Amino acid sequence: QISVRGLAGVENVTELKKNFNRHLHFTLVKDRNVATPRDYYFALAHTVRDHLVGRWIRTQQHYYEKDPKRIYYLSLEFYMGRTLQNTMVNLALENACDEATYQLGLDMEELEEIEEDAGLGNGGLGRLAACFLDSMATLGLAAYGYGIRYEFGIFNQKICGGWQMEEADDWLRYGNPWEKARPEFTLPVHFYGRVEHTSQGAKWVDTQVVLAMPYDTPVPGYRNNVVNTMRLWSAKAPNDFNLGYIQAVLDRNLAENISRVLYPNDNFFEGKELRLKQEYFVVAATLQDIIRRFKSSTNFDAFPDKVAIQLNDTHPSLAIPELMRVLVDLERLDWDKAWEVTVKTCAYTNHTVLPEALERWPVHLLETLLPRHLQIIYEINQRFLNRVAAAFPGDVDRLRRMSLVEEGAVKRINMAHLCIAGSHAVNGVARIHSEILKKTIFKDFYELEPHKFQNKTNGITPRRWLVLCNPGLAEIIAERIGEEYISDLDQLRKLLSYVDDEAFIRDVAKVKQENKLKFAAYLEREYKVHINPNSLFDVQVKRIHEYKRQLLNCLHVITLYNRIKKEPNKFVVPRTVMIGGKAAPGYHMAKMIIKLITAIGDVVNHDPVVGDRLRVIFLENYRVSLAEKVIPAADLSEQISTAGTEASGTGNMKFMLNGALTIGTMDGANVEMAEEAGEENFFIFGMRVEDVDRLDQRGYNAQEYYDRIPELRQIIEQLSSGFFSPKQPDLFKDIVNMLMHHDRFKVFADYEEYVKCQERVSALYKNPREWTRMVIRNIATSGKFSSDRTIAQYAREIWGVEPSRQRLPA
Amino acid sequence: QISVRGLAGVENVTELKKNFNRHLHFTLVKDRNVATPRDYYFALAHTVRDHLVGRWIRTQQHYYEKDPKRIYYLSLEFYMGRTLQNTMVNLALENACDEATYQLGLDMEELEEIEEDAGLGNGGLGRLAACFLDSMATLGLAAYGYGIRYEFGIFNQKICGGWQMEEADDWLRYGNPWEKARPEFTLPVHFYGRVEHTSQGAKWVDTQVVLAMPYDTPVPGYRNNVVNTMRLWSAKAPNDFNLGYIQAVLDRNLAENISRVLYPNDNFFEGKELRLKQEYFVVAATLQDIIRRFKSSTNFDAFPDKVAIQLNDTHPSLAIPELMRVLVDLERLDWDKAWEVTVKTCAYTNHTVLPEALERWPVHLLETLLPRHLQIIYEINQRFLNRVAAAFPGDVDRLRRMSLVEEGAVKRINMAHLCIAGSHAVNGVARIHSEILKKTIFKDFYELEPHKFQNKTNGITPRRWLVLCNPGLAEIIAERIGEEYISDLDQLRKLLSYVDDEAFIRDVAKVKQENKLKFAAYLEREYKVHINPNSLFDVQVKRIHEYKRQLLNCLHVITLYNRIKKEPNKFVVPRTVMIGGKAAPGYHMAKMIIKLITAIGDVVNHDPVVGDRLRVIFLENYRVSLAEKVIPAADLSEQISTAGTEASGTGNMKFMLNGALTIGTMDGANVEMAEEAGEENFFIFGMRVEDVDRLDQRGYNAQEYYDRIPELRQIIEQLSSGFFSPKQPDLFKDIVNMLMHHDRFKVFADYEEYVKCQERVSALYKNPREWTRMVIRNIATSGKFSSDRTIAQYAREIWGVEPSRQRLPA
């Protein structure tokens, strides 16, 4: 149908149809009379998977022969989403498969909806890892993603009585056609035990063993015939485990629990033993695999020339002392040489400055679980602090500030400090964030080793986040400037010369309207909810957090409702306000915010005076596949975190690429987005980082705003009196109390400017032509935010490898 | 190479080679450079599996169109062993695959050794179910095996310091290429809860739900293009299960533990809640599946015309009250009609008279776990006892003897009594056993309903137990009488006219010698043990039991050793005595017997005076695949259970078919074997059932035998004094004490006759020609013991269906 989806050749379509039929018969053991839509999905998935294998085998053979430097990306999270469409896009198979399935009497889009998300992440950090894998493959890097194959990913969110309920994401129930189990490469991982000192060094003995079994998933590059590997580890008990008889067999579950479930916390540290086991498990298995591959090319001097290890946050920070352990205890290298190798191998990416996200593990936990690693950490700390003392003589407070060991009620290890000490590079994820690192939380470390500190502004893959989810937009762009932008997103700048093109303006606006109609149809079919497709689609989708300020959005929504009720017969630009996202199960305030949103909707959506002028919808079970549906349909992107709290954001970039305008604070990557597009083409409001700092010095008093803003007073009175909860008048007492007395994120301080700025949004939306022209200026300048750019910078500035767009032979 | 293994056509070999290469590439994602022998095994397994699917789909389609009466074989155990060779045999693919793999540079026998046994059974009962499935498919019956897919089957046995050690049989570790998961046919199973009585009957409410997910395995008939199904259920927690968050997800293991592990007890009842859950789990899921299929053909009058349910022992006895529950509570049938349907549908097979194997469940367990079933059982009991009282008025002791409810310290339900009441047929498994049932333990029931009681003498499949494991013998037989005997084993009688044929005598003896050489080679390669292949191979392989009397064998072994030591320079026929089998982990005495065997070997095998005249070897990890190796190599089959204790035995039949002579008591199927071959061609010794009865009346005094038999006294003195355990003199005190004071199985009473009979064995072995002629008379008369005969009798006399040897179109 459309050009960017590839060719549907006679030979290809015929071959796909026959291989589809073969898989239905031989693989699924079904015929057409009994086959269900799910059977058809699997037959298609297996058919497409067949096209990967040849390329997958030859890519890995190529790496064996050429022996390039290998990149190992370690993450506890890989938020992959669905794989079928992505694979078709990257292999240029989409139109051929669409045709083949059509001739078989099947609708391919319907089959695509059957695939479960691989929801092995919480949000931004996990999705970044996924975009990165795509970009590394597209840029021809010898890269491997290493993580955990969780049996249960991020929970499925149900809304019951306006409240979040959690249920197990049993994503493997029907099988996963993309993975290949590799039980032959199973490796042992050690826990507990004790340290013995002998004539020939330290020995870690009397350990409990858990097996790590790898599952490999192919990662295809964009039309370059490169297929890289994501290797995920699964926990297995050894066969002599606890070996009355029956109980010993049942107790194997204890060992296998390590890979059972993803901790559902977004930017929050929970200091639980099971989590620590997961972190060591992935690190220990991964490092053995790395060393084995390195030896199969004695001399570890060349190790950093052949290996790079990227730590996605501090979660895999144990890689540092584990590498030291292997090199010193097992390979018998001297400390100083092992350390040189470790530092030159490892690099660390920081994702947040928020204190509650920082990993600080109790010494007593590491003492019991990983006794040798604790000893190595103490030794790292001693040697590091000796360097600090020699650089800054007599500065005793600096020594205590920089220590990897934090003294107090319970002694803890600061994992971020460990990462900085043991890495040759430390990066933040947006320019403002990286500057904050150097100026505040890691200031001491920056003064000691300034060369270590870098910035690598985040990005998103334009394959998933444009071509896949918004083919209509990708096509009208390709009609003007060709297809090369898909792997060179900077070419979108060429669209600036079409900002006054009447045909293009009409086409951009038409693509948006179609996306909005499709999404309005999705909502009725799957959730029986009625929305006006001619209204402004105002969307905030992201994890529920106090720092992300869904509450500020709530306050605006109520303001609009109150204004309508005061002057019912006045014209207002109609809006559909959509808010979605998951709350961590134990995050009480975030769960209260969800209830508030649904409670507002219950009042607003049923007021006859409002009509279809204002609608408030909570988007249930927000996840990658839902993002691919709602983001193309959005007019307004809400990016309204308190300045200095959102390190980068990536959701912001997805909206920019897909033709929504942004209302946002000067926070994270919003700053660079506004800089690229021009501040005139962005709806910027609120305190800057400097303004937040000034308010903190003075002391934030929420009462001041309550006293001086009558519209804000009314909302607080409504919340307090039970206007939004008639049967439970005091339901939102915690929210009001927080806002009035302990709001770390200064919701009231940005309220006036936010409301004013929203009025300017509505004014522009009244002028469709000028709305769309501003949209074109955003899309045209979104190129910087391709993860291809991000990965090219990691490659050249951290990993010491050169990216390549050259094809491998098919 | 050999005729019975089929044709190796040019077209077939070429096709197999290309499909092997396809699977290696696309399925295993490997090329020849990195592929391991295991990869080659899987490529072959997938290639052979492809040949099943067409036949599998069309067989099940055939049953849908013709709508025959369906046979449902319910068992907690299916001891399948390996599947690859069996599938090739039944599809006539063995020579073609041998050729195809040879041309690829691979040895097929080596690849066959890679496959794990499906060890989902303990011994005889589980292996009987497996032979039955093979025969039902070969006889064209619309049959389904229903069981549990245990994650862990019968433990792998290791011998350490002469002691049995157990380890988990992780048989699914590398995957199972034969099964097809069917998550779409998942069914709920209910536990706990309570009973509510309403206006419209009883209701079972507030239950906990466990999901039952089916996995289907193909069961191919012998060259008839029929492929039947074995459906095994796996336990899955529902997604809202226990839905802090993390613990709730981890607690899903509790539900899934139901299908985790096979109880490793052979002919022994262990009254554990987990076992009861397994028994209900298989029954509840199976019965829903049966009823669904029956409806997809309102009127349950035709139910018994379309459905037969065979209960393999009392393990699935809950099928009776569960069928009543569904028919009465859910379908709203009146009691009397539901009962009529139930009785006409169900039939029960008894496997033993030993009291410790009989299932007697505490009322309090059923009360908590299955409250509605307990109520139904009480009602069954009341109505049944009203029938007894009307038939035998005033016989109050009969009422208490026949009750399904046993009164005492703890009230129990007798599951065997339940089965008899609710079945239209009850069978024993050998003529002597079935007579014992009618005369002793079920005498009261026989007097009430004599028409119910039948015999169905056990059998073994000649495919696995001759063609597969002994191709050399199968071939020399086929050279004389053709191939038709493989599915009509009675044709072996034609071999009687070759008993004086000098060529045949030479060939039979040559095949045995080759088998013995092959097995002697297997022992050195895998276990580094040296045996003399010219010695008499004296073997007892079966589960370790007091009733099976491995101890009597031990006493003979010691007698032989003592006789050699007394007269070293006297000629004796050299023997290799092999004993193998697993002990239930909690069966202390059986574990002591294993230690005794190894302890005897330690002394005997290292005495220089003995030389290679006597060797004692414990065969480690006895299982189906080992049986297929040792049975063809055996000269003498030890079948020496106390008369009246071994219901049938099936190991006995395997040895008879494979050219070993039998030393045995008149017990189980030994009686019918001797009757078929002629008592002159069997080494029968010891007490008959009548002699055992007479000794019990008088009182068994072991001291009498000790006092009057000097050779026996010496052995007991040796055991007591520490001759076989110098460092632990009192090691075997328990064994001696048992033998002298509490031996329920009268080891001493059969000792003299056994030793005398063994002397007659050695005498015959000295005359190779006459040994072999007696062998020919055994093989020639083994036809009755084909499971094809057994299944034809079940079909005609219990199930009301006619077997068919007619081919389905390929």
Ligand SMILES: CN1CC[C@H](c2c(O)cc(O)c3c(=O)cc(-c4ccccc4Cl)oc23)[C@H](O)C1
């Ligand atoms: C004082 N108390 C407030 C709640 C907080 C908390 C919980 O008790 C439980 C949670 O799951 C979370 C969470 O997911 C994220 C954040 C969080 C994360 C970043 C910034 C600010 C906050 Cl409040 O906080 C959480 C912690 O107990 C400290």
Ligand SMILES: CN1CC[C@H](c2c(O)cc(O)c3c(=O)cc(-c4ccccc4Cl)oc23)[C@H](O)C1
């Ligand atoms: C008195 N005591 C003896 C041991 C017996 C027992 C155990 O304690 C544990 C077991 O695992 C078994 C077993 O597997 C088989 C038999 C058994 C089975 C059939 C006939 C005779 C016997 Cl002894 O007995 C077992 C039971 O506790 C009664």
